[PDB]
Amino acid sequence: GSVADTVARVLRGCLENMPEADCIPKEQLSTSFQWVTKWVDYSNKYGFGYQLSDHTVGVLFNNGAHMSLLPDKKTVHYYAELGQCSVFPATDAPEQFISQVTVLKYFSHYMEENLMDGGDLPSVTDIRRPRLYLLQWLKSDKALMMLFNDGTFQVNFYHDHTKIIICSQNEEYLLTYINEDRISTTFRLTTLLMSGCSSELKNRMEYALNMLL
Amino acid sequence: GSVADTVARVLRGCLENMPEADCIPKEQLSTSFQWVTKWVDYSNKYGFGYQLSDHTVGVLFNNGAHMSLLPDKKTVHYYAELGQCSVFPATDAPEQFISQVTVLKYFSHYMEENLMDGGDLPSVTDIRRPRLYLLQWLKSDKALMMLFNDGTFQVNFYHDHTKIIICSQNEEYLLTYINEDRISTTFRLTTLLMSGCSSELKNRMEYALNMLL
Numbered sequence: 438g439s440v441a442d443t444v445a446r447v448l449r450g451c452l453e454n455m456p457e458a459d460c461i462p463k464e465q466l467s468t469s470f471q472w473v474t475k476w477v478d479y480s481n482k483y484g485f486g487y488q489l490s491d492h493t494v495g496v497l498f499n500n501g502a503h504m505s506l507l508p509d510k511k512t513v514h515y516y517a518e519l520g521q522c523s524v525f526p527a528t529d530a531p532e533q534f535i536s537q538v539t540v541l542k543y544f545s546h547y548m549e550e551n552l553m554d555g556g557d558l559p560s561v562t563d564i565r566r567p568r569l570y571l572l573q574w575l576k577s578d579k580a581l582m583m584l585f586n587d588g589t590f591q592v593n594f595y596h597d598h599t600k601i602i603i604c605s606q607n608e609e610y611l612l613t614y615i616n617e618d619r620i621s622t623t624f625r626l627t628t629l630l631m632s633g634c635s636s637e638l639k640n641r642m643e644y645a646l647n648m649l650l
Numbered sequence: 651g652s653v654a655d656t657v658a659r660v661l662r663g664c665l666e667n668m669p670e671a672d673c674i675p676k677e678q679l680s681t682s683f684q685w686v687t688k689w690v691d692y693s694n695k696y697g698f699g700y701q702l703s704d705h706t707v708g709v710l711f712n713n714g715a716h717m718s719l720l721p722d723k724k725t726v727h728y729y730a731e732l733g734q735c736s737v738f739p740a741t742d743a744p745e746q747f748i749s750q751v752t753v754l755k756y757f758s759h760y761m762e763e764n765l766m767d768g769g770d771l772p773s774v775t776d777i778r779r780p781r782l783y784l785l786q787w788l789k790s791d792k793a794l795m796m797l798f799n800d801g802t803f804q805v806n807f808y809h810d811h812t813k814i815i816i817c818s819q820n821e822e823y824l825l826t827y828i829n830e831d832r833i834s835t836t837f838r839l840t841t842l843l844m845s846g847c848s849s850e851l852k853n854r855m856e857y858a859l860n861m862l863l
């Protein structure tokens with residue numbers, strides 16, 4: 438889409454115009470944003486589940502619809518296959534959505550039990566309107582790529598358990614790298630543009646881009 | 651990428667030179683070839699496992715290495731990250747490969763449906779015959795795409811459980827469609843080039859190509 442091309446433009450921008458370096462940029466930031474902390478791929482039966490930094494649980498179903506359980510664990514936002522948003526308590530759900538609500542609770546409680554948080558990025562205070570949802574995702578043999586409505590871009594790698602997140606804060610683009618020890622380092626794209634980067638963050642930046650294209 | 655580019659050349663070939671139609675080409679061929687009957691994605695822990703029509707079980711590990719278990723469940727083929735082939739029994743496996751061997755058996759035993767008496771149990775001829783393996787795969791919210799050693803090309807869709815397989819038996823290109831009700835129909839690409847096809851098989855061919863690109 439237009440969102441995907443925008444992120445890919447700036448990611449490529451920073452990539453072939455950045456110096457060669459020894460280490461990751463020393464200028465790092467202490468802010469919190471929205472990102473995927475836990476994820477679950479059950480696409481062969483139901484769909485793709487993810488948990489956000491504010492503890493929102495979402496499901497991108499195979500039929501195309503979105504379902505989100507809010508941090509209060511009571512309220513459900515449901516966007517259908519064409520985009521009609523319905524908001525209703527999860528406890529008493531219309532009998533059209535019960536099947537989907539059940540699966541949504543199932544994802545929400547698989548993640549908390551079996552799965553572990555992926556980074557020490559500070560839990561976020563929540564609100565932006567409209568609310569974030571996953572517009573598309575794709576998986577290769579090397580990495581998991583997720584792109585959201587608001588343009589936040591995340592790629593998870595399997596073996597290293599390393600991650601890259603590209604977000605928009607105020608007027609800047611941020612790149613956050615999450616290393617082998619689940620630890621957050623956040624840069625500005627501008628600073629990474631002029632100051633270069635490490636060998637293994639640049640390899641991961643190169644790969645994240647190939648997934649977008 | 652040479653393999654992918656070959657399939658993409660002829661598939662785009664047939665796609666941009668085919669009429670628009672209402673129905674499927676009637677001139678069909680009846681043969682069977684090698685394709686994936688079972689697949690299992692555990693990429694964040696092990697890798698991607700698959701079972702072939704000839705009862706070979708393969709694992710594409712996240713690191714890029716391939717490991718194949720022969721139909722007899724006795725012999726292990728190990729192709730290294732770019733193609734160094736190692737062959738050894740699973741019972742007697744070099745202790746360099748165990749971690750990888752164990753995982754291959756784990757997939758092999760997931761592949762195992764519940765055991766039901768019956769015959770004939772699959773058996774191997776040559777203990778050293780280079781069987782095709784997965785070169786790379788990609789998954790979207792709609793489909794799984796797999797590209798193999800010999801250039802065999804397969805796209806599985808989730809909700810429909812519908813499949814497309816592009817093969818080269820020689821040295822012509824075949825497209826096999828396996829529809830919503832489990833029925834295989836195999837055409838020649840030349841036939842699909844000149845006569846067009848159904849509305850959404852053309853839509854499924856279009857999606858398969860976009861996944862390659």
Ligand SMILES: [Cl-]
Nearest residue numbers: 669670852856
């Ligand atoms: Cl068209």
Ligand SMILES: [Cl-]
Nearest residue numbers: 692695696756
């Ligand atoms: Cl397990």
